[PDB]
């Protein structure tokens, strides 16, 4: 069953990438480089496993990871990459909602304060990409920020957190979202004195976090406009276009790009579980997840359980942790859809 596929990928990922301090190394060829936001998504994958199985063995692995991230980041959680902080904050609030472990909440609160400090009037709003790159406002430092704020609002029910979610999402939609397709451009930045939007870089995980934010805003407010937003973006993901090759989410390389597919699948799946989704869209989205899962399972996984950047070809060399996490995420999402 899909659950057993996901469990096997979980075990393989853990054993191949485990390294010092309960964190996870950059690749399977001995590169020990610490990648903060990849390890945040490893936390996300471990939570996926815990939620599926209820197996208590996930909990020490999660906790060690949380603490190891702090150590390998220089004995602090703050990072000059603001998107990094947002991703870890999301994982921490997910875990808090599931375990009530206050250590995760305290980390998330620190990171939320860091995140808000990244907002500025450059380009009319939005959270900066990095604390030393204030003039770049990126989909990956805003979509996740809106999700982070929505999890915080769901938990502490402080209205200022929903205010923040709405502010962030409104700026994102106005600036970086194509009004017709709902695809999401990577960033707006100043280059040689002038403001440029990179429309060439349409990445899976940016439309993914836009969908995720839209879906959570729908759940936080009830307003159908958010669900319509989510549906338009997701429908453009399913239909043939820039993000698919033969009905399969495209190869976006390794390194950071290796993780992009998995993040889209995560939030795509959360949309498909939205109770107010029309039945036809639900069936279509579930089918899309199944088709990608089948394709990776039969054509992309090496015998040892490693997924490559192209879910249709087995990798023959280095596999970065990010790439592998995307495969694990797809399988956990399929299992979640039963």
Residue numbers in the entry: 54 to 391
Recite the paper's sentences.
The marine bacterium Salegentibacter sp. The tertiary structures of all three ShGH76 variants indicated a single-domain protein with a classical (α/α)6-barrel fold, with six α-helices forming a core that is surrounded by another six α-helices. Multiple sequence alignment identified the aspartates D136 and D137 as catalytic residues in ShGH76.
In the apo-form, in total twelve α-helices and six β-strands were present, whereas five β-strands were present in both substrate-bound mutant forms. The atomic models of the monomers of all three ShGH76 variants showed continuous peptide chains containing residues Asp54-Glu391. Besides negatively charged amino acids, the ShGH76 active site features seven aromatic amino acids (Trp90, Phe134, Trp140, Trp182, Phe256, Tyr258, Phe313). Superimposition of bound Man5 from BcGH76 suggests that Man5 does not fit the cavity of ShGH76WT due to a steric clash of the Trp254 of ShGH76WT. The terminal mannose of the Man3 and Man4 ligands adopted a kinked conformation so as to occupy the active site, which has not been shown in GH76 structures. Superimposition of ShGH76WT with ShGH76Ala and ShGH76Asn resulted in variations of 0.23 Å and 0.21 r.m.s.d, respectively, indicating minor loop movements on the protein surface but no global structural change as well as intact active site cores upon ligand binding.
